[PDB]
Amino acid sequence: RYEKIISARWIITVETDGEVLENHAIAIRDGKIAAIIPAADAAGLEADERLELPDHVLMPGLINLHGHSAMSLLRGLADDKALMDWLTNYIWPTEGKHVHDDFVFDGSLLAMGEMIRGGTTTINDMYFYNAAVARAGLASGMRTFVGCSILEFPTNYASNADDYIAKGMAERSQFLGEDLLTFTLAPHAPYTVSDDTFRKVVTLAEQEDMLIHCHIHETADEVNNSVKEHGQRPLARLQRLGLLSPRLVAAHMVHLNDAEVELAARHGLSTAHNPASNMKLASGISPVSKLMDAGVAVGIGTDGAASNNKLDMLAETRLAALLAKVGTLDPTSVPAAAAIRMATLNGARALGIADKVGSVKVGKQADLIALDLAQLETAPAFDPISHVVYAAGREQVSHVWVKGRALMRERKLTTLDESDLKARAGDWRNRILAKE
């Protein structure tokens, strides 16, 4: 028998742009999409659970291709400052004082409860204390990529580049054979990582077959300083070092010339587009249309909650679509179907799992969400694709499944204790503000 049969008014498949099935149902077995059939035919099949969702659209879960989940604990602590001031006087001293395993576990859990509430099923994270993020990911049941961050300078976590690498690999080894947990190597950025460290990352990722997750070309300063320090722009340096290949997920990628767009396409890297962070930090506008036109997989991330300050992939997908139009001055840039593909199947492509998740197709894993469109905010309901991108909100996600397992049902979290998350956040408020 099937484990579940979920019927819905609409299903946005993401198999082809614009495809929406009406009054169909998804049958699930072994954690995968077993059949996609007319809801009429579903009524007479055996299932452990049946669920009927009138006025809901079912769609693949959203894939947040770039986060720093534990920074949820720093959400709105300091805003609207010059960047040097914000980092030097607020963020870094706070991290130095507070970031240990406890902070990372609590902050990751808090982020995961927020992400699930908004229909995010996969997170591509990168932070410190990788065992804590992994523990949080297995607790939540999200599809989790834990990014083992690598920096040259000392932090609470590790003392130098070789130490970040060793500790990350050691923690990875405690979590082997977990289907929903994948460790990646995460050299932080070209301006915090030396040539020799990049070489070690290239060698290691090749030996162990790991993804590389790195902030690249976020700011004009980064790109201009690279030339003075390394004699060439960061992408050209990384090409020389062997970093550009299909295993690389390049976050931000804001400042690109046309030669660099072609470079990305030729090496098959993917990018994570982080529009709110790029706007809030005044980084600029990533040329996502150029990138996608060149054949590059452009997914969407939220970045950290201290520069967003939401972890809302629906809002981020809408912002990607809006920012693309104002940046190109073309109202046809990044149409709703394209934005949905960025938020789902492109994230899967970036992560090397597009054969397994990212669209509603038989044989793929059942990473799905349902949104209730019977609200004023999405009335009248003409076309669910348009509404998902331009009108629907995080509050309308009613159900979330990852590999067919319910993580949220009628907005009740099933794997995390929402009260506990609020209490951890409240504790951190007192600890960070020195209130008792």
Ligand X SMILES: CSC[C@H]1O[C@@H](n2cnc3c(N)ncnc32)[C@H](O)[C@@H]1O
What does the per-residue mask of binding to a copy of itself show for 287-316, with x meaning CB under 8 A?
------------------x--xxx-x--x-
Annotated binding residue at 218?
yes
User: Min. distance of Cβ 95 from ligand X in angstroms?
Assistant: 5
What is the C-alpha separation between 98 and 431, in angstroms, rounded? 8
What is the C-alpha separation between 241 and 232, in angstroms, rounded? 12
Determine, following the binding rule CB under 8 A, whether residue 44 of this chain makes contact with a copy of itself. no
Cα radius of gyration rounded to whole Å, the chain: 21
Tokens, residue 98: 């507070």
User: Min. distance of Cβ 31 from Zn ion in angstroms?
Assistant: 30
Determine, following the binding rule CB under 8 A, whether residue 1 of this chain makes contact with a copy of itself. no
User: Min. distance of Cβ 221 from ligand X in angstroms?
Assistant: 13
Determine, following the binding rule CB under 5 A, whether residue 95 of this chain makes contact with Zn ion. no
Q: Binding residues for a copy of itself, how many (CB under 8 A)? A: 70
Annotated binding residue at 196?
no
What is the C-alpha separation between 373 and 55, in angstroms, rounded? 6
The DSSP annotation for 138-196 comes to HHHT-EEEEEEEE-SS--SS-SSHHHHHHHHHHHHGGGTT-TTEEEEEEE--GGGS-HH
- Nearest alpha carbon to residue 370 among 33, 26, 49: 26
Q: Binders of a copy of itself among 95-134, rule CB under 8 A?
A: 110, 113-114, 117
Determine, following the binding rule CB under 8 A, whether residue 89 of this chain makes contact with a copy of itself. no
Q: 379: which DSSP letter?
A: -
Amino acid at 6: I
Determine, following the binding rule CB under 6 A, whether residue 286 of this chain makes contact with ligand X. no
Annotated binding residue at 31?
no
Annotated binding residue at 372?
no
What is the C-alpha separation between 141 and 115, in angstroms, rounded? 12
Determine, following the binding rule CB under 6 A, whether residue 92 of this chain makes contact with ligand X. yes
Choosing among a copy of itself, Zn ion, ligand X, none, which partner's interface includes residue 149 (Cβ < 5 to 8 Å by kind)? ligand X
Determine, following the binding rule CB under 8 A, whether residue 398 of this chain makes contact with a copy of itself. no
> Nearest residue by C-beta to ligand X?
149
What is the C-alpha separation between 236 and 349, in angstroms, rounded? 23
Q: Site for a copy of itself (CB under 8 A): which residue of 380, 410, 434, 436?
A: 380
Distance of CA 247 to the CA centre of its chain: 16
Burial of 76 (0-12, 13-18, 19+ CB in 10 A): exposed
First to last CA, the chain: 54
User: Min. distance of Cβ 42 from a copy of itself in angstroms?
Assistant: 23
Determine, following the binding rule CB under 8 A, whether residue 208 of this chain makes contact with a copy of itself. no
Choosing among a copy of itself, Zn ion, ligand X, none, which partner's interface includes residue 381 (Cβ < 5 to 8 Å by kind)? a copy of itself
Q: Site for ligand X (CB under 6 A): which residue of 95, 171, 303, 312?
A: 95
What is the C-alpha separation between 420 and 316, in angstroms, rounded? 27
What is the C-alpha separation between 312 and 310, in angstroms, rounded? 5
What does the per-residue mask of binding to a copy of itself show for 218-257, with x meaning CB under 8 A?
----------------------------------------
Nearer to a copy of itself, 36 or 77 (CB): 77
The DSSP annotation for 188-241 comes to --GGGS-HHHHHHHHHHHHHHT--EEEEES--HHHHHHHHHHHSS-HHHHHHHH
Q: Binders of ligand X among 187-216, rule CB under 6 A?
A: 188, 192
Choosing among a copy of itself, Zn ion, ligand X, none, which partner's interface includes residue 402 (Cβ < 5 to 8 Å by kind)? none
Determine, following the binding rule CB under 6 A, whether residue 91 of this chain makes contact with ligand X. yes
Rounded alpha-carbon distances, angstroms, from residue 213 to 38, 178, 246, 281, 362: 41, 20, 11, 20, 30
Choosing among ligand X, a copy of itself, Zn ion, none, which partner's interface includes residue 95 (Cβ < 5 to 8 Å by kind)? ligand X
In the annotated binding site, the residues are 66, 68, 92, 95, 149, 188, 215, 218, 252, 303, 349, 352, 354
- Residues in contact with ligand X by CB under 6 A are 68, 91-92, 95, 126-127, 149, 188, 192
Binding site for substrate, by residue number, is 95, 188, 218, 303
